[PDB]
Design a protein around this ligand. Structure first.
Ligand SMILES: [Ca+2]
Length: 263
């Protein structure tokens, strides 16, 4: 599952946690991120990274931390990732080096770190001993999400009946009823910037038994002009001596969910 490197590969990896109320209010969110650098050719070992000048490297809310061998100074003044010791070069063993980390915490009702909103509507059902559930979602991502997995923490006896007419992605399917994990429903696609819903009926003792519901999703692009969800990105890669001398590179921009849930 490790992506292919043609010389310099820069991975920008962000992970998002979030907690919503049943009615859709954001209680909290926390985003962690890291910039990893992989190089496999000694010709390119002796290089520097220029972050997009779109980025405020002094924003206190991002809590930016640089690897202890990176030059804090050049980073802070020039948005430049380079080694303190200008005589040394980066490892050329194709191994991931984390050169920069960041973390952002948003308080209740701040929706700036939320790629996917969530709300639930829940009534007792006719057809089963339990509940009719609708989960409304809305993406604000510019790419589309694939194989999104909603998990309810119950193990019912009768199987789940997905209301395919009242849902948006009609071919949603259950993919797991364990006892340990509970019941997990998968969705093919969530379209960029589009709202949707997932509707179904499920067996359960009482309403609180359905929560917390967890969502799980993931997204990746290899585009060289890619921005992260928080606007993180590379301007250029550049010779450690001749700063006008550009070098070639690829960049992967990921965003995975971790503890993303409705409670
Ligand atoms: Ca450029």
């Amino acid at each position: 599952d490790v992506p292919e490197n043609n010389g310099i590969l820069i991975s920008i990896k962000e992970v998002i946690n979030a907690e919503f109320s049943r009615d859709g209010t954001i209680h909290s969110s926390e985003l962690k991120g890291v910039l990893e650098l992989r190089i496999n050719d000694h010709d390119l070992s002796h290089s520097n990274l220029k972050l997009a000048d779109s980025i405020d490297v002094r924003d206190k809310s991002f809590q930016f931390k640089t690897h202890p061998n990176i030059d804090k100074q050049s980073f802070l003044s020039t948005k430049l990732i380079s080694l303190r010791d200008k005589s040394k070069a980066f490892p050329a063993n194709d191994q991931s080096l984390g050169v920069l980390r960041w973390r952002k915490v948003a308080p209740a009702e701040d929706d700036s770190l939320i790629p996917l909103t969530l709300t639930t509507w829940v009534s007792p059902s006719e057809s089963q001993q339990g509940f009719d559930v609708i989960i409304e979602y809305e993406s604000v991502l510019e790419t589309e999400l694939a194989d999104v997995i909603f998990t309810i923490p119950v193990f019912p006896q009768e199987p789940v009946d997905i209301n395919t007419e009242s849902s948006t992605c009609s071919d949603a399917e259950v993919v797991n009823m364990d006892q340990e994990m509970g019941t997990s429903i998968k969705i093919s696609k969530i379209a960029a910037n589009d709202a949707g819903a997932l509707a179904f009926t499920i067996e359960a003792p009482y309403e609180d038994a359905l929560y917390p519901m967890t969502v799980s999703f993931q997204e990746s692009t290899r585009d060289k002009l890619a921005k992260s969800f928080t606007g993180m990105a590379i301007q250029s890669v550049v010779m450690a001596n001749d700063h006008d001398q550009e070098l070639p590179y690829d960049v992967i921009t990921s965003l995975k969910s971790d503890e993303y849930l409705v409670q």
